[PDB]
RNA sequence: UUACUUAUUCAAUGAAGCGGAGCUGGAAUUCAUUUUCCACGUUCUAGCAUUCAAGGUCCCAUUCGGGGCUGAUCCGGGUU
RNA sequence: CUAAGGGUCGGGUACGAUCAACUUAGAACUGGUACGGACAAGGGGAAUCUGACUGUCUAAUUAAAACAUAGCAUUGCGAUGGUCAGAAAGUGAUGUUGACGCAAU
RNA sequence: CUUGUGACGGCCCGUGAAAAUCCACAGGAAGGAAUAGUUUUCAUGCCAGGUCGUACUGAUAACCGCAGCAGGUCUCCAAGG
RNA sequence: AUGGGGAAGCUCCGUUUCAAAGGCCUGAUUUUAUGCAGGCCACCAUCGAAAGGGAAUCCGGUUAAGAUUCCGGAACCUGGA
């Protein structure tokens, strides 16, 4: 119970991966995936409209 | 509150500063299925919990009792 | 063995209220209790939960809808009317 | 003699609103520099039942423009809005169910909810389950926009007024017969203490204008002057007509 | 192509190192007496170089840019393959199946991989690979 | 038509049905064509599409829900993506696709 | 009659980007050249967006630290 | 007294051994024809009047056919509002509201 | 049998409180070693913990009904046939 | 309660509302005790539950009459070191 979480080792309040005791792995699996492609796609949009600008 | 089993770690307790007192318990208890034997427990009273060391062997019991610090304030039974 | 000639889910109301009343309610109870195709994952895993709120069993998507069915007539039309009008913005 | 019931509801005692379980007041994003020049995105992070409401609400989370945080607003969920959907809000915004645009930026025929009567009032018109407005004209100079309200009255408001593209989820609520006393009972249990209602003509004359008589009967005309006095307005107040509305209605 | 070759950069998607970019060092495309799956041996980056600046001078720059690397056997279904790539010559011998098992081996292994990754970063060859993937 | 071709891929060639397996096709290079369904989420979408161009495999966005893509391959269950390993007697690879 | 804002009245906002002019674009057609009007960072995805900002540049007397200017055009202080 | 209804193990890649449950039906015998043996425990039928129903009230002579109710119908009002509160007010209820709404019959 | 708990399921125009408080996570300001530096979310060790209630009845006699009044007054425990 | 606004007035209205509403982390002191330096945060009273929320205790023994409170034993929580 919540005041008991200050009577316990930190390793009782996480798992070692990124976002340990915050999100549920799969939900971290997604946000790695999503962010990468979206940050890739971001690029994909950059140079295409540099192309529309120089080629209009 | 606690139970202990590395006979060495125990000896190191009975030399752990804050451990003024200690007590030893002798129980009649049965072996396997047929007969009895002489179980003994080696209770160290540390400042915050009470560690007890069960020594099944009636033989190691006798040589351990000698091992106890001679300024420890043991209470036999 | 078909249990009831016609009262259907409504047979809980016994004899009360009058047939027109029970009829009318049966139509919308049947509407509000049945499952529905999830637009996002295809599984018919969309059930109700209070005044026009519709969520997906698995998938967990939740879509605001009509009080006793998912897609109200008026919204559907409105949808396509919104389609129609927005077409005039690019084309 | 006695004060009559419709006068007692005014001091608001047993009569105020059963507010404990309400998600909050549904409003629109405040009209900041992002919504009057461009657009800003949110995610409907959840749509959820407001207690005592006909329609669901939808919780739509946006960034703060001027600070690093999340700010959250409570919308009335327009039908077909789904969790995780993206919602776009302001002038240069696009025409889809869910977004919130000035009445200027939509063409006539748009269908639009929770619309401000003055701009920036964060929403006033057509909010109840199923209602909406229609835009029916625009006068560019003096940037008005002419809408038709769920009642049917035809108001003209500013174009800088905002509205949410669509109709309000929960339609048809009132189609289903209430059917027994108790559901009316629980209906009002989350609204206000308006139920059940006693027939003024079952009262004693000290209780109502309709009260008393050796049979129940209203005794005088049940149509009450627009300039009646508190303690008098009980009947069809200021009714311009009366009797069963034969024929078709609908404003022309 | 069979794009899972000694050049590909991949981002980890499961397990501790999830979220960090690796470089496949040696793929074993199907099977292991241990790992009975398609698994890539990689040396990704654990503690990324912190941003530096003009204010940053002296041995602060030296310290911000320190890298903590890591080697790793990974199932393929835990990397996403990237369109980037980075060279694997300085640690071809270093990262071997034999490097795993016996921890001192892994220590010397990383040591190389560390002198290597800090080589690349100072004078910023392969610049994407030395930046935290934010999700 | 586009389903008629699929019916030929379906009774003469090699394919795999579903997400997990059609990634093993994209890493092995064995894909000649992956067919993405309509409602399959944009992440699953964009993730195959990145996996696609990393093996130079072309991507045909099927314009129907995964449920009807299931009838397209003749199976009674939904599928959100196919993968064509061998085009049997059909021509899908070398026509409009 | 119909205009004006400063009295009075109402709305909103932890009074945040108002008004006026200008850089650059471009629709525009030139009857000497500009006579104007629009514009002038974000829309496949339930990710991430904070340390006066990295950069560029100038100073402190070269320490670690730290500061201008710019990045963020100008003018009016009528919060809208 | 009979019959029907179960658990457990080992069997190369038909069955056996044991353990533990009150149900239900059938059949004998038997009695001063008695046995839901005390206790426990519905009178039924046909109508007329009347209110649909469950609910409500005159504490302490009225529980009804009276009130309510769903259902039906009417009225008022787009907020600079409708109804209602205050001696007043930079005052208040409806209102965390907005006609699939609030108020009034 | 009681009671607790779980995985479900039915129900609504009803979908069935708030805050104190504790935890975690993203972040990466900053602080830190080899002649030796960091660590008290691991273990062991030390001191401290005020004020106020605490008896008993709770009812055909400890309450309210002029009373040691057949009335009234909120609740937990619950054996065998 | 409060800036306020009404009211001849006892008082009535408002509770963050037409208000210049406050305070934590440390740094700058090595005249010295704590000014200034930042960077924050704008949360605006308070009262309201012995059935709601909530840090942590148990068995044995003992009294004419008290006990999860005393005695015996064995724990635990919080604040400080
Ligand atoms: Mg753990
Ligand atoms: Mg970290
Ligand atoms: Mg049957
Ligand atoms: Mg009088
Ligand atoms: Mg009187
Ligand atoms: Mg009063
Ligand atoms: Mg209230
Ligand atoms: Mg509503
Ligand atoms: Mg009401
Ligand atoms: Mg009432
Ligand atoms: Mg009535
Ligand atoms: Mg009435
Ligand atoms: Mg009467
Ligand atoms: Mg009268
Ligand atoms: Mg009269
Ligand atoms: Mg009368
Ligand atoms: Mg009458
Ligand atoms: Mg600088
Ligand atoms: Mg004047
Ligand atoms: Mg403002
Ligand atoms: Mg300006
Ligand atoms: Mg048997
Ligand atoms: Mg048997
Ligand atoms: Mg009878
Ligand atoms: Mg008669
Ligand atoms: Mg009756
Ligand atoms: Mg009954
Ligand atoms: Mg009754
Ligand atoms: Mg009476
Ligand atoms: Mg009498
Ligand atoms: Mg009765
Ligand atoms: Mg009576
Ligand atoms: Mg009646
Ligand atoms: Mg009625
Ligand atoms: Mg009728
Ligand atoms: Mg009306
Ligand atoms: Mg009014
Ligand atoms: Mg009013
Ligand atoms: Mg005044
Ligand atoms: Mg009970
Ligand atoms: Mg629920
Ligand atoms: Mg926690
Ligand atoms: Mg500790
Ligand atoms: Mg007591
Ligand atoms: Mg007594
Ligand atoms: Mg008595
Ligand atoms: Mg009992
Ligand atoms: Mg309280
Ligand atoms: Mg209090
Ligand atoms: Mg309490
Ligand atoms: Mg309590
Ligand atoms: Mg005791
Ligand atoms: Mg005593
Ligand atoms: Mg005595
Ligand atoms: Mg006692
Ligand atoms: Mg004690
Ligand atoms: Mg002790
Ligand atoms: Mg402590
Ligand atoms: Zn779904």
UniProtKB/Swiss-Prot annotation, chain A:
Transmembrane segments: none annotated. It is found in: Cytoplasm. Coiled coil: none annotated. Belongs to the eukaryotic ribosomal protein eL34 family. Component of the ribosome, a large ribonucleoprotein complex responsible for the synthesis of proteins in the cell. The small ribosomal subunit (SSU) binds messenger RNAs (mRNAs) and translates the encoded message by selecting cognate aminoacyl-transfer RNA (tRNA) molecules. The large subunit (LSU) contains the ribosomal catalytic site termed the peptidyl transferase center (PTC), which catalyzes the formation of peptide bonds, thereby polymerizing the amino acids delivered by tRNAs into a polypeptide chain. Component of the large ribosomal subunit (LSU). Mature yeast ribosomes consist of a small (40S) and a large (60S) subunit. The 40S small subunit contains 1 molecule of ribosomal RNA (18S rRNA) and 33 different proteins (encoded by 57 genes). The large 60S subunit contains 3 rRNA molecules (25S, 5.8S and 5S rRNA) and 46 different proteins (encoded by 81 genes). Present with 23600 molecules/cell in log phase SD medium. This is Large ribosomal subunit protein eL34A. It comes from Saccharomyces cerevisiae (strain ATCC 204508 / S288c) (Baker's yeast). The gene is RPL34A. The chain holds residues 58 to 113 of 121 of the full protein.
Swiss-Prot record, chain B:
It is found in: Cytoplasm. GO terms for cellular component: cytoplasm; cytosol; cytosolic large ribosomal subunit. One of its GO terms (biological process) is cytoplasmic translation. Keywords: Cytoplasm, Ribonucleoprotein, Ribosomal protein. It comes from the Eukaryota. Its main location: cytoplasm. GO terms for molecular function: structural constituent of ribosome. Component of the ribosome, a large ribonucleoprotein complex responsible for the synthesis of proteins in the cell. The small ribosomal subunit (SSU) binds messenger RNAs (mRNAs) and translates the encoded message by selecting cognate aminoacyl-transfer RNA (tRNA) molecules. The large subunit (LSU) contains the ribosomal catalytic site termed the peptidyl transferase center (PTC), which catalyzes the formation of peptide bonds, thereby polymerizing the amino acids delivered by tRNAs into a polypeptide chain. Present with 50200 molecules/cell in log phase SD medium. Belongs to the eukaryotic ribosomal protein eL38 family. PANTHER family: 60S RIBOSOMAL PROTEIN L38, LARGE RIBOSOMAL SUBUNIT PROTEIN EL38. Component of the large ribosomal subunit (LSU). Mature yeast ribosomes consist of a small (40S) and a large (60S) subunit. The 40S small subunit contains 1 molecule of ribosomal RNA (18S rRNA) and 33 different proteins (encoded by 57 genes). The large 60S subunit contains 3 rRNA molecules (25S, 5.8S and 5S rRNA) and 46 different proteins (encoded by 81 genes).
From Swiss-Prot, chain C:
Keywords: Cytoplasm, Metal-binding, Phosphoprotein, Ribonucleoprotein, Ribosomal protein, Zinc, Zinc-finger. Transmembrane segments: none annotated. SUPFAM superfamilies: Zn-binding ribosomal proteins. A zinc finger (C4-type) spans 38-59. GO terms for biological process: cytoplasmic translation. Gene3D superfamilies: 2.20.25.30. GO terms for cellular component: cytosol; cytosolic large ribosomal subunit. It is found in: Cytoplasm. It holds the Pfam family Ribosomal_L37ae. One of its GO terms (molecular function) is zinc ion binding. The modification Phosphoserine is found at residue 39. The keyword Flavoprotein does not apply. InterPro entries: Ribosomal_eL37/eL43, Ribosomal_eL43, Ribosomal_protein_eL43, Ribosomal_zn-bd. Present with 44600 molecules/cell in log phase SD medium. Belongs to the eukaryotic ribosomal protein eL43 family. NCBIfam families: eL43_euk_arch, PRK03976.1. Component of the ribosome, a large ribonucleoprotein complex responsible for the synthesis of proteins in the cell. The small ribosomal subunit (SSU) binds messenger RNAs (mRNAs) and translates the encoded message by selecting cognate aminoacyl-transfer RNA (tRNA) molecules. The large subunit (LSU) contains the ribosomal catalytic site termed the peptidyl transferase center (PTC), which catalyzes the formation of peptide bonds, thereby polymerizing the amino acids delivered by tRNAs into a polypeptide chain. This is Large ribosomal subunit protein eL43A. The gene is RPL43A.
From Swiss-Prot, chain F:
This is Large ribosomal subunit protein eL30. InterPro entries: Ribosomal_eL30-like, Ribosomal_eL30-like_sf, Ribosomal_eL30_CS, Ribosomal_eL8/eL30/eS12/Gad45. It comes from the Eukaryota. Component of the large ribosomal subunit (LSU). Mature yeast ribosomes consist of a small (40S) and a large (60S) subunit. The 40S small subunit contains 1 molecule of ribosomal RNA (18S rRNA) and 33 different proteins (encoded by 57 genes). The large 60S subunit contains 3 rRNA molecules (25S, 5.8S and 5S rRNA) and 46 different proteins (encoded by 81 genes). The lineage of its organism: Eukaryota, Fungi, Dikarya, Ascomycota, Saccharomycotina. GO terms for cellular component: cytoplasm; cytosol; cytosolic large ribosomal subunit. GO terms for molecular function: pre-mRNA 5'-splice site binding; RNA binding; structural constituent of ribosome. Keywords: Cytoplasm, Isopeptide bond, Ribonucleoprotein, Ribosomal protein, Ubl conjugation.
């Amino acid at each position: 119970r919540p005041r008991q979480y200050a009577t316990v080792s930190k390793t009782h309040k996480t798992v070692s991966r990124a976002y340990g005791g915050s999100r549920c792995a799969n939900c971290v699996k997604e946000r790695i995936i999503r962010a990468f492609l979206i940050e890739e796609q971001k690029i994909v949009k950059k140079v295409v409209k540099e192309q529309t600008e120089a080629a209009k | 509150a606690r139970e202990i089993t590395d006979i060495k770690q125990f000896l190191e307790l009975t030399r752990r500063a804050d451990v003024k007192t200690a007590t030893v318990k002798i129980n009649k208890k049965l072996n396997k299925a047929g007969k009895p034997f002489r179980q003994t427990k080696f209770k160290v009273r540390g400042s915050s919990s009470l560690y007890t060391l069960v020594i099944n062997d009636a033989g190691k019991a006798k040589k351990l009792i000698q091992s106890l610090p001679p300024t420890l304030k043991v209470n036999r039974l | 063995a078909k249990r009831t000639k016609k009262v259907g889910i409504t047979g809980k109301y016994g004899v009360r209220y009058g047939s027109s009343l029970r009829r009318q309610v049966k139509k919308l109870e049947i509407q509000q209790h049945a499952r529905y195709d999830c637009s996002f994952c295809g599984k018919k895993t969309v059930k109700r939960g209070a005044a026009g709120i519709w969520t997906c069993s698995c998938c967990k998507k939740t879509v605001a809808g009509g009080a006793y069915t998912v897609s109200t007539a008026a919204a559907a039309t409105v949808r396509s009317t919104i389609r129609r009008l927005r077409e005039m913005v690019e084309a | 003699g006695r004060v009559i019931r419709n006068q007692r509801k005014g001091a608001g005692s047993i009569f105020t609103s059963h507010t404990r379980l309400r998600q909050g007041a549904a409003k629109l994003r405040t009209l900041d520099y992002a919504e009057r020049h461009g657009y800003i995105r949110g995610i409907v992070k959840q749509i959820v039942h407001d207690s005592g409401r006909g329609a669901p609400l939808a919780k739509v989370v946006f960034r703060d423009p001027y600070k690093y945080r999340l700010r959250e607003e409570i919308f009335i969920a327009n039908e077909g809005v789904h969790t995780g959907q993206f919602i776009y809000a302001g002038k240069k915004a696009s025409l889809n169910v869910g977004n919130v645009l000035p009445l200027g930026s939509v063409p006539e025929g748009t269908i639009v909810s929770n619309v401000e009567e003055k701009p920036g009032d964060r929403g006033a018109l057509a909010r109840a389950s199923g209602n909406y407005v229609i835009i029916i004209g625009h006068n560019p100079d003096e940037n008005k926009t002419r809408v038709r309200l769920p009642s049917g009255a035809k108001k003209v408001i500013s174009s800088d007024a905002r509205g949410v593209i669509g109709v309000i989820a929960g339609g048809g609520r009132v189609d289903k017969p209430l059917l027994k006393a108790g559901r009316a009972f629980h209906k009002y249990r989350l609204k206000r203490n308006s139920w059940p209602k006693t027939r003024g003509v079952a009262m004693n004359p000290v209780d109502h204008p309709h009260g008393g008589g050796n049979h129940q009967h209203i005794g005088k005309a049940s149509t009450i002057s627009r300039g009646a006095v508190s303690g008098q307005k009980a009947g069809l107040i200021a009714a311009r007509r009366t009797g069963l509305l034969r024929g078709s209605q609908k404003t022309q | 192509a069979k794009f899972l070759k000694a050049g590909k950069v991949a981002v980890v998607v499961r397990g501790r190192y999830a979220g960090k970019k690796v470089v496949i060092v040696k793929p074993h495309d199907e099977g292991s007496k241990s790992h009975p799956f398609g698994h890539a041996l990689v040396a990704g980056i654990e503690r990324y170089p912190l941003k530096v600046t003009k204010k940053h001078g002296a041995k602060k720059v030296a310290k911000r840019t320190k890298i903590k690397p890591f080697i790793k056997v990974v199932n393929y279904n835990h990397l996403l393959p990237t369109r980037y790539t980075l060279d694997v010559e300085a640690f071809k011998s270093v990262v071997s199946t034999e490097t795993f098992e016996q921890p001192s081996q892994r220590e010397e292994a990383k040591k190389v991989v560390k002198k290597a990754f800090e080589e690349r970063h100072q004078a910023g060859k392969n610049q994407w690979f030395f930046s935290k993937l934010r999700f | 038509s586009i389903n008629q071709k699929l019916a030929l891929v379906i009774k003469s060639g090699k394919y795999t049905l579903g997400y997990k397996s059609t990634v093993k096709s994209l890493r092995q290079g064995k894909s000649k064509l992956i067919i993405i369904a309509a409602n399959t989420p944009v992440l699953r979408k964009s993730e195959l599409e990145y996996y696609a161009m990393l093996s130079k495999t072309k991507v045909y966005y099927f314009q129907g829900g995964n449920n009807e893509l299931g009838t397209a391959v003749g199976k009674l269950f939904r599928v959100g993506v196919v993968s064509i390993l061998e085009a049997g007697d059909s021509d899908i690879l070398t026509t409009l696709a």
